[model samples]
Target: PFSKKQLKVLTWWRKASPVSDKDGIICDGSIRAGKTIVMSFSYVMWAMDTFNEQNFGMAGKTIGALRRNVITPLKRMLKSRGYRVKDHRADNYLTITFKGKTNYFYLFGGKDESSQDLIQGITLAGMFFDEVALMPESFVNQATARCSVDGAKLWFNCNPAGPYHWFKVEYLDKLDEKNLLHLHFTMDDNLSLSKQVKERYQRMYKGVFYQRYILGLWVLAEGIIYDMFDQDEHVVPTVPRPYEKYYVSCDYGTQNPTTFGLWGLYNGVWYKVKEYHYDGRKENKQKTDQEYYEDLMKFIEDIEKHKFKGVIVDPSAASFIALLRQKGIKVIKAKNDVLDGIRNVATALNKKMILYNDCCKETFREYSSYVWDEKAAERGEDKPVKQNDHQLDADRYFVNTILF
Candidate 1:
């Protein structure tokens, strides 16, 4: 029923001779990649091997995520092993008895920074951290900080994320150097899935969604604004130098964040490598056009060093546009067309013709939160909610003015 990639992990789990011999294991992979089922078998055995009566843990981003993902399936396996589990609901743990010694595995969620307060002073023989990457750094640090046992081990399993996300950059990538074991998996690795079944799963993700979830790589967000934007396909290493081949677009805001996008054209495709975001909301101040100009030039000074192309701007920004033209920067009056621009971007993204780098974080973050105004959608309209979209506008402005 299981594929070789998953079967080996399960096989190695059941045949381990020593108690708590490995420091930890990370099952990193795609959705329904069979790692969760294999992890269940490993967790129960690892806990059983480590201590007769000592406590352990079963953790996730939420108790429901933990149950839906693991406990429901794990319960059947435990039952098959002649080991019925008990949940002491009032105290929050599952109990299993072995060698006449009863032990418990606490179930918890690391919802936020303050979530660590819930498990503040607990000790564990080991821990099974489900979807480990989703938990906050503070919670993970606090929870693992108290694993004081001589042979305490940790087990983590999750899908992929940004290459620089803490779990990958600060932890998983350093696993080999720091004495940890992590198994990598892909959709092809799950031979247990029939071709039709695999294709069904494949249809759910596109672009970066496919790269991160289906291919199981540490990639960026495939957000609402640009669902077809793939981290691997759209994000790049180094953009071509000089501002001669590039265009600039601005989304000016005095109360919210101001965003500027620098785009370079390559064979009719646009690659965005850098962005400038000025946060005025937190400071509770409005910046003048002069201040905006200073920050914009300073940001673009090093890489975006040429002034050959036209600048795109929101027409409402009369002051900023006047200043741009005053400085001899040609202004392309913004086309405030929302869906028309989105449709164009989506097409380019789906065709793998649009690219952005890690430096355009605000651009990506804005994309993730830039969902459609559902109320408008119900009215047969396609208006997007105006929140968290400054940087997103910078993108729309460039593409709409330059290409459309």
Candidate 2:
């Protein structure tokens, strides 16, 4: 099922780029566009063909991620192709031998600023960066600096990011200047993906995510965070009877607004049946954790307690979570990655997988006013404006944790 685009990646070094002797290659595009497997296979093959007894580098945002995403499949692939592969798990490297030629591949993680320390002092014949866009620039630069061997080259694979992303600006936009061949991929490039699977991925994103993850475009994420949200389409008067399960998502704060969303699952959709919003400043008195717990009890007293799944609470609300647990209420810590949570919530609303009750006025109002931070975007950061987002945070917590 290898397409021409994938084939190009496999043979570019041997055929197309040998003449120009390009410094490296960059493959970027939509998620699951079949870049990682082919790029890793080709990089190792090229390394074995061009050099012997050389040290090479393979990197990802984290070592565990690198192993799961690249090393496991790659080792199996090499073994199937009759290469003897040995992994030094403790040392985080691999030894591969083919046709009596052998080489060492050291693995590194570029997760933070201090990751540059891991690559320092190592001499590498070549380097491969998986999900290069997620890595810090300093780590990438330091890794590239280690490639001092004769005929050394770099390999990079990633999905598109913001228009001003460093990788897009420094490497992809200036392809010739970087001496890199840029290949953009879509789901069509990955012939192995099924029609149903592609449709599922398409439904998993909207707005800026659609432009970036679905269409593979380098674009800005600004303005309303959920531009696809339409009250007419997404708000409903009532959900159908006999819900499958019930859960609550809460964003608890003493000083800030305390927001809770009651969700019910029926068929394939999640219905936001009710919401509880409390602002201490408006009430002129801040409620204690116990008081909020009593409010939450009343919030769901009408529903059957046995069918309730659990409460997904903000992890930072440790004291409140402890109180819930002591009262025999199951509390699941919400995954708090703000941008990722926003994307999931956006997709849920955009695809109509989530419907809000017209009675949840504050939640609807917050959804309408949830704007992106233009000042943050100007500095190349994708951030939502903090105001008017409490109820939206509760909704996002539910969507990101349970739905996705």
Candidate 3:
């Protein structure tokens, strides 16, 4: 029960026997791209036929996902082909009676770092990985390592994810020549999906989801507020000089973490010199607005003491802004335009004009991990996930209102 593309991939793997580079067949693409079904079928056949009376493994992020996505289809397919298969869910294995040869397949979870220990020291002749992208690198590496037994083969399936994801960078985008086979599938590649279903799914995924899942491209986050902040190009080892004006931007929070970024405008480039971050979540600590205001003023005095044009702040920090004005500290409301501010930040970054120094590590990390809200995108909403973005918010205020 393989699709045309699935058959093509199976044939390719069959012809290219004894996987090279210790890599296996990776069926990666959009959800419902129709790769998993055939991958599971081919994996069982290959394991049973090639490695007779031996042990193998099956794995996914969780047992639930494995059973639903891989195991059910696998059992149904094998049953139709006249194989007497007994699923030992209690024992976490599958007892397959094929060609008078008994094969024992154990199930494993590859959910997180600790999940790696689940398959530790277990020797597997052949393995099947469902949604390999969802599993952590530690778990994937550990599982793959256990397959050191001679002539062991591997099968993998997953959708495209983050641009710098280890899987894509290491395995998917390797040298010109690869020991592993990466089969890319798209919505169009799935001949079973109807036009109406495609349209419905398209509507479900708004922005980044459309590119990564529907188009099956390894893309950056959807609703990524800023696509222009290239760490290699924009982040600098040394602070750019000839900065005419210095500005301070703060995203204040009492319970949530507060962040402050020191920025400078220099020769048509905005340089983030450094950052000050205070975590309120640690030990359930609390600091009043007045206390924070006092600490922040002193912090800035020690870093760079000068009359700044405006102290950009989160609009909701009214009390903190009031204290700043009362203390004769210049305060300006943050630029709150969600779409425009984000786009313009990218523009500044694309122009290579926004320079973030090495000191702004938190800001840099957020730029990398910050992603579009997947839930919102699927619901036809336009918004980035509002986490680990305080520095980003402050940076946006400077770029949108002052720099741009």
Candidate 4:
């Protein structure tokens, strides 16, 4: 048994010890927080202390170690403390029985969900999940189910991964709402760590990356670019005035559908007014290219009092741009600076300068799904090579040629 402050100084221990009756404990700490490993050792210590305090004779002992380095020393220490600790090499199962009792307490090492069979045959007072984040969600679920015994406590300890990580989504996020006990420990919180070591680790991994690991902070991974546009800030309906200057940006794809967006320039802001996203899945699938052009012309012609600015088309669709021009629609090939354009679009979105109407569903979908290639980023590169590039491309072109 240790005070809260003293427990904070143990390098091999986590802050989730001395299980509370009123609140669930969360050992949220930095990479070297030692919560998991320390909790494992402490559980053994506490269990032994419980038996000794009760004057329960040491009859039989079993201890299981999933990883050799972590639990090997604790087993020896427990053995030296007059507790019979034995290693059941087959699947890390330890069956320890107290004198004068037919029942035995069991400890099992679970590397994953499948390895949970180690404890299938015995009853458990409690179970500890070391490095719970590394364990599969299924493993954690199954382990929790095994804790049906009265007064059984389930312990979990790990560093933070991400918002989408199983532990974060299922457990950490709901800590406050569920009245669960949660403890967060960073390098600064761990008094056992020397200032030199703490500073060294900080220097090795700086910024967001460092924050996630060393400090156990929930930080987004590097190179994963979220769309800069926000629905509340960037998206809006058409302006009341029909006399507004409007331009149409097109990203043509026969298979992916041809997307055309009606944008308005008002008070130095670019607002998306309307959109025509032809999926080609309808009865008009067989419509010829000329028919499609005439249909677009008709749509533009029908809009009342709107001054038509030049149409911006992908540079690859120069022929289409020329065709539109031949039909008396002013059109221009949009300059394709792939990387810089994406940066500009991201900048606008990050700064909340871009606006969109609710009618632009396709554009909104594009903004939500756009992400960077993480593997490519590891090699010091830019450029997204995944799906959902069309709207992003159009957005870049729209920003570069008109908005910028």
Residue 18, model 4: Cα distance from true site in angstroms:
10
Worst 10 residues of 2 by lDDT: 111-120
Work out how many backbone clashes candidate 2 has.
0
Q: What digit string (tens of lDDT, one per residue) describes model 2 on residues 98-209?
A: 9999999999899743446658888999999998887888788889989999889999998877877788778887988878888899999999888999999898788789
Tens-place lDDT digits, model 1, residues 1-404: 77776766665444453322457778897887888877877677667755788888888987877888888888888778777589676566798865566678888888833336657878888778888877777777777776788777777888876665678876787886755677898877766678898887676556655677788987544236566656766677764543347777899988778888888766666778688887877877879999888876776676544544777899889999888788887788988777557755665566555678777887777766777665654433336788988888888877777776
Pairs with steric clashes in candidate 1: 208-230, 234-355
Off by over 4 Å in 2: 15-20, 88-91, 112-117, 194-204
For model 1, the local distance difference test gives 0.73
- Rank order (by lDDT, best first): 2, 3, 1, 4
* Best candidate according to TM-score: 2
Write candidate 4's Cα lDDT for 1-404 as tens digits.
44363264232223364434523345776776555555555555544433332211010111232445346655665566555655555544454333422223344444533355544444455566555665556656765665555545555666665556667777888876745566676666555677888777665444444566776776544443443354766766655644357787887777666767777766766777777777675645654567669768765775544478778888777667777878788886787766547655655665555677787787778666777666654443434765766766776788877755
lDDT top scorer: 2
Off by over 4 Å in 1: 11-21, 99-101, 112-115, 222-404
Model 3, 1-404: lDDT tens digits are 45677776656546474444445778888878888888887788767766667778888878877899888988988999877899997767888877877787888887633346658768888778887776777777777878877888777788877666777777777734446767788767678778999887665443455577778887765645555555667768764466677888888888778888888777777788788888878847888888787777776674444536768887899988888889888888976776457656766665566788888888888887777777764443346788998888888888887866
> In model 3, where do residues sit more than 4 Å from their true spots?
15-23, 112-115, 175-178, 222-404
Q: In model 3, which range of ten residues has the least summed lDDT?
A: 13-22
